[PDB]
């Protein structure tokens, strides 16, 4: 029955490539080492053809390098501060959902040009002093076009159709599953284009690269209150990408990010490789040579 | 098991010959194809102006200099005002196509230098900030038929390292080895069709990695010519022509 | 009321826990999946793509010139052209590589590496280079006679402008920590030194200096272990 399915659920190890035993090759016309990098093809030279190799039955597992295992890890995608003290006596915050505000998730995602994934959003909410009193919060997903709340009391919080999570700060972090929500067949971290037609002659070309296919709306968070609580709440949002398809691998960003929704670097271009003294300098003392 | 150095690319009424080729790159192993009914979303019949749009358009020649930093184009943009392609790309809202990009740079056996010719899908151009200066202008994002000189080829004008641009479909033009670079690129997008004016599906970078060095008496004007051919151009959404 | 007993680990949010979670949208059917060229499923497939080594990562050199290994006609014999270590997670030339940047998302690595050197001189420029990989234990070889005792290739410039130096997996452990330095030089892969086997010989009216472009990649037996956070880009404030 289904016991066969449950048995084949553990991750079976897939091993790296074995090395075959090789011998010396003295001849002409067989040049496994001469390549042509101009072809855009990487070298197909094997260690069995450059050196005399032994037979290694390689049992190293290559599973952890999957796109799933690389990406199915919850990282901080949003820090929301529900301000209800001082000058900002709001008790609610409407947060634009963007997973590009923090370096670790953003850099990992931009390894890919297109990604199609579901997500497991977790909300870690606490006070300034790390404490978690019983405080009912509402976590309303406001999809693009839905009325956004303008107060802690406004009618939008009735969440008749919007998905809302109600949880106290004392409860374990609210965690939900988000599907692949996009008019496109994949999210697009790099959109070489403009969302609208026009001349695009504005002094601030703010719309370059802004694909509305990634704009998935706003997370509207409030404390379920009747007046100012006097407490600021820090909600931290962690996305765990799952069921992930990645397309068009890209270079991992080498320059420090500056803004959220734009590739933009400082004129002080940092070298992708740390500098050394000369092209003949290495940082390795090694052992004492037996006969220099 | 060899790659022949001579090659002839023939599409439409255009034929490109090379005698120093370097094994044409088929981007991501996938030839350009028309949109399968399974992946199509628009319901209008697409136009397929096969021979009038799928053909080699020679579009720009850039003089390679010793201090040259490189140039980039955007594939639909570089053809949006050229031939029956540009007219189909203006009259139609939806467009999809692959391309065969043939970059031509020949020099003597006494010149040296290597060019990195790469086809970058979704080549979002960055602005270098020391606000209005935070985003690149339309001339840098869509340079057109002329292309744009690289400001910082090291970071590809995108913040990403040039040394990893070989993750994209690329060839080299090493002057001692080859005088051309051919990249066949299918249609890459999260959408089956898209606007040829709003969206640039691929960037077309030609960056000198090893600089052009010659001696006194050698031809100083070593040009780089970009010839691109749409492949399987479909156009839907016929309306008034928009530039 | 089925009798249960909560064990330690209840209410914890382990960020790497692959568990179920309640769907926010019942009945949601996503946009149909269409074919997009270029799907990658493994980061090992990306580590096998040859990317340029920044071997000229020297103080003063800027830009694309950091990618070039200068090679010129020598007045002496058996001189060192360039050297670099082959620890893919070490600060240095491998930082500019896809393999060296995907390694830094992992704690331990294993497998043969590969540097593809492309000569970018004139067709009339001839030469022969000895590119030696020195296994651990020895510092950078001081002479070519000492370097040729290790895994090396003699590279003849010609119509095939590129050569591959397969850095073989020569390790005591099955895996090597990506972290190097200190006691973690227990995992130092070694040094690669480029030597002039013969001279860089050019005819008259031909440039006497040229450039080797190194291309670092991984072999088919390359492996990565223990996903970790990379040390590449830092952040002090949220980006908008």
């Amino acid at each position, epitope marked *: 029955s289904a016991v066969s399915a449950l048995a084949d659920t553990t991750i079976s190890r897939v091993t790296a490539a074995n090395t075959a035993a090789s011998t010396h090759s003295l001849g002409t016309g067989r040049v496994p080492a001469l390549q042509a990098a101009e072809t855009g093809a990487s070298s197909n030279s094997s260690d069995e053809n450059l050196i005399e190799t032994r037979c290694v039955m390689n049992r190293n597992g290559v599973n952890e390098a999957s796109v799933e295992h690389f990406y199915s890890r919850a990282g901080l995608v949003g820090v929301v501060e529900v301000k209800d003290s001082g000058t900002s006596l709001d008790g609610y915050t409407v947060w634009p959902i963007d997973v590009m505000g923090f370096v670790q998730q953003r850099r990992k995602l931009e390894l890919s040009t297109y990604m199609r994934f579901d997500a497991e959003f977790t909300f870690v909410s606490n006070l300034n002093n790390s404490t978690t009193p019983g405080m009912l919060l509402q976590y309303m997903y406001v999809p693009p076009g839905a009325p956004k709340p303008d107060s802690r009391k406004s009618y939008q919080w009735q969440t008749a159709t919007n998905p809302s999570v109600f949880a106290k700060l004392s409860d374990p972090p609210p965690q939900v599953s988000v599907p692949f929500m996009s008019p496109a067949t994949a999210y697009q971290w790099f959109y070489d284009g403009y969302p609208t037609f026009g001349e695009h002659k504005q002094a601030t070309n703010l719309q370059y690269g802004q694909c509305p296919n990634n704009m998935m709306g706003h997370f509207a968070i409030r404390t379920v209150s009747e007046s100012t609580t006097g407490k600021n709440i820090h909600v931290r949002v962690y996305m765990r990408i799952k069921h992930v398809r990645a397309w068009v691998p890209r270079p991992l960003r080498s320059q420090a990010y500056m803004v959220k929704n734009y590739p933009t670097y400082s004129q002080t271009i940092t070298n992708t490789a740390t500098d050394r*003294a000369s092209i003949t*300098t290495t940082d390795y003392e090694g052992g004492v040579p037996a006969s220099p | 098991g060899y790659s022949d150095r001579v090659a002839q690319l023939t599409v439409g009424n255009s034929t490109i010959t090379t005698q120093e080729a370097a094994n044409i790159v088929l981007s991501y192993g996938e030839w350009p194809e028309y949109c399968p009914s399974t992946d199509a979303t628009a319901v209008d019949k697409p136009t397929r102006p096969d021979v009038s749009v799928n053909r080699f358009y020679t579009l720009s020649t850039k003089s390679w200099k010793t201090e040259s930093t490189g140039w980039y184009w955007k594939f639909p943009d570089v053809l949006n005002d050229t031939g029956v392609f540009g007219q189909n790309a203006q009259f139609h809202y939806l467009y999809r196509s692959g391309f065969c990009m043939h970059v031509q740079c020949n020099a003597s056996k006494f010149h040296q230098g290597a060019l990195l010719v790469a086809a970058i899908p979704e080549f979002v151009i960055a602005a270098s900030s020391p606000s209005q200066g935070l985003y690149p202008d339309f001339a840098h994002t869509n340079p057109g038929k002329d292309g744009q000189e690289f400001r910082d080829p090291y970071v590809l004008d995108a913040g990403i390292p040039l040394s990893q641009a070989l993750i994209f479909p690329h060839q080299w033009i090493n002057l001692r080895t080859n005088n051309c670079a051919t990249i066949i690129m299918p249609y890459i997008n999260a959408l089956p069709f898209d606007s040829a004016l709003n969206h640039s599906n691929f960037g077309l970078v030609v960056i000198p990695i090893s600089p052009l060095k010659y001696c006194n008496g050698a031809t100083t004007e070593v040009p780089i010519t970009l010839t691109i051919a749409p492949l399987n151009s479909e156009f839907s959404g016929l309306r008034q022509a928009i530039k | 009321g089925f009798p249960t007993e909560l064990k330690p680990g209840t209410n914890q949010f382990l960020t790497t826990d692959d568990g179920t979670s309640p769907p926010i949208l019942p009945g949601f059917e996503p946009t149909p999946l269409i074919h997009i060229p270029g799907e990658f499923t493994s980061l090992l497939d990306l580590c096998q793509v040859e990317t340029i080594l920044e071997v000229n990562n020297t103080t*003063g*050199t800027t830009g694309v*010139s950091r990618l070039l290994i200068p090679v010129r006609a020598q007045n002496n014999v058996d001189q060192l052209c360039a050297s670099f270590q082959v620890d893919p997670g070490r600060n240095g030339p491998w930082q500019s590589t896809m393999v060296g940047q995907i390694c830094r998302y992992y704690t331990q690595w294993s497998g043969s590496l590969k540097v593809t050197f492309m000569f970018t001189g004139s067709f009339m420029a001839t030469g022969k280079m000895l590119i030696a990989y020195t296994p651990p234990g020895s510092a950078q070889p001081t002479t070519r006679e000492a370097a040729m005792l290790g895994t090396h290739i003699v590279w003849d410039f010609g119509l095939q402008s590129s050569v591959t130096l397969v850095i073989p997996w020569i390790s005591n452990t099955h895996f090597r920590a990506v972290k190097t330095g200190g006691v973690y030089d227990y995992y130092a892969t070694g040094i690669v030194t480029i030597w002039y086997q013969t001279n860089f010989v050019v005819p008259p009216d031909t440039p006497t200096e040229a450039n080797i472009i190194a291309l670092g990649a991984a072999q088919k037996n390359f492996t990565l272990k223990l996903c970790k956070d990379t040390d590449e880009i830092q952040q002090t404030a949220e980006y908008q």
Partner: antibody
Framework: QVQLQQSGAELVKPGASVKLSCKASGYTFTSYYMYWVKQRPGQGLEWIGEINPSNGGTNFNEKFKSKATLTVDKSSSTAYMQLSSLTSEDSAVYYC????????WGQGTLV | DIQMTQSPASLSVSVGETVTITCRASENIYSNLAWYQQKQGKSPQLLVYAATNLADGVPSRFSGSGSGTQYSLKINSLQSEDFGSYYCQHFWGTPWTFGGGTKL
């Protein structure tokens, strides 16, 4: 070879500014930083600052930030240093140094 | 700012002796040291780059060695023209602190 030709000697009245030149030759100018070193006669060498001939990025010492301005003419392959607020402690020999893999120095400029 | 500390501030030896200058550093400069020989009147001539690479034209009598914090320049078979001032110079980071100097 890699020759850095600095400007001629300078004799400027106090409270002024002089534009010292450094016409690089023999290498790609936009590929190496240009550094300036100050040496009062008898005293040692003092590093003024750097300039990248690709973005104008200049990093001076804490004792020369408001006393030296570095520019570059990428078309002319020439670097410049215009010492502002000239004094007596600013009368010295000035060199332009490129390092890369080999420290190349100019000839100097008496100021 | 990684500052320098050149140990021998002055030295006077005869032709044939072997003088060894020392150039410490505040922090590890990673072989980013250059020794110069400047005789008053001429321009600073580079002797050893990267703390070990003998510059072009410099006689094999000169030798640079060291790693990390401590570095040493040795002049074996001290010929006649080996007089003047000897400056070490770190080129690791922002300050680019030169050496104090060594009269010889």
């Amino acid at each position: 070879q890699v020759q850095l030709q600095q400007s001629g000697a300078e004799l400027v009245k106090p409270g002024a500014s002089v534009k010292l030149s450094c016409k690089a030759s023999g290498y790609t100018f936009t590929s190496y930083y240009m550094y300036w070193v100050k040496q009062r006669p008898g005293q040692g060498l003092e590093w003024i600052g750097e300039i990248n001939p690709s973005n104008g990025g200049t990093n001076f010492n804490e004792k020369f930030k408001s006393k030296a301005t570095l520019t570059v003419d990428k078309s002319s392959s020439t670097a410049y240093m215009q010492l502002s607020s000239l004094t007596s402690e600013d009368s010295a020999v000035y060199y332009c140094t490129r390092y890369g893999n080999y420290a190349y120095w100019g000839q100097g400029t008496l100021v | 700012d990684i500052q320098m500390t050149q140990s021998p501030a002055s030295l006077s030896v005869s032709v044939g002796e072997t003088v060894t200058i020392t150039c410490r550093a505040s922090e590890n400069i990673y072989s980013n040291l250059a020794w110069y020989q400047q005789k008053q009147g001429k321009s600073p001539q580079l002797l050893v780059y990267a703390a070990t690479n003998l510059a072009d034209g410099v006689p094999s009598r000169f030798s640079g060695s060291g790693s990390g914090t401590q570095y040493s320049l040795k002049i074996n078979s001290l010929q006649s023209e080996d007089f003047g001032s000897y400056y070490c110079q770190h080129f690791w980071g922002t300050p680019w602190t030169f050496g104090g100097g060594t009269k010889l």
